[PDB]
Amino acid sequence: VIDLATITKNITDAVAFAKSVKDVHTLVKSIDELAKAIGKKIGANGLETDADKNAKLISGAYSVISAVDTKLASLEKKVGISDDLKGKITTVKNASTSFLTKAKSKTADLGKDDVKDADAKTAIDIADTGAKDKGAEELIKLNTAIDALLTSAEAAVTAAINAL
């Protein structure tokens, strides 16, 4: 009296799902690395200060969240996910779309020839002490939503290993 095939499939499934979620979490976290580059140039010894001219960096962030967005779109579709987890996915996807919509709507500010440090922070820096009025707020919401989904996905992996 025991049971292995079903338990094995359950760990495989839960791990496969966590993989997709983890990949999305990494991408979102990575905007924090891009924010460190606001107003920075590559110099002889690493990043040094060279304020402003940030547009293409924000474009980078936008490109990354685009990929997040596309990945979640595809996750939303996976078969055999619990209603629960599908909901947590939708919350992330909504947050991601939100960020992209906000950024687009601030084209005049974020796409101009010289986006100043302050404004770049309002788009992509979650520790921004300024207004978070050009993406940052939406980025915080995304971070909260993906942290929730990842917590759930990893919980399932743990449960599937210990139900062993």
Point out which residues bind Ni ion (CB under 5 A): 50, 147
* Among residues 17, 38, 75, 92, the one that binds a copy of itself under rule CB under 8 A: 38
Smallest distance, a copy of itself to C-beta of residue 34, A = 4
Please, which residues bridge with residue 49 across strands?
40
User: Pick from Ni ion, a copy of itself, none: which does 58 bind, CB < 5 to 8 A by kind?
Assistant: a copy of itself
CB closer to a copy of itself, 54 vs 98: 54
Which residues ranging from 95 to 134 are in contact with a copy of itself (CB under 8 A)?
100, 103-107, 110-113
For residues 58 and 38, give the distance between their C-alpha atoms in angstroms, rounded to a whole number. Answer: 9
40-59 burial string, b = 16+ CB within 10 Å, else e?
beeeeeeeeeeeeebbebbe
What letter does residue 111 receive in the DSSP assignment? S
Smallest distance, a copy of itself to C-beta of residue 110, A = 5
For residues 84 and 78, give the distance between their C-alpha atoms in angstroms, rounded to a whole number. Answer: 13
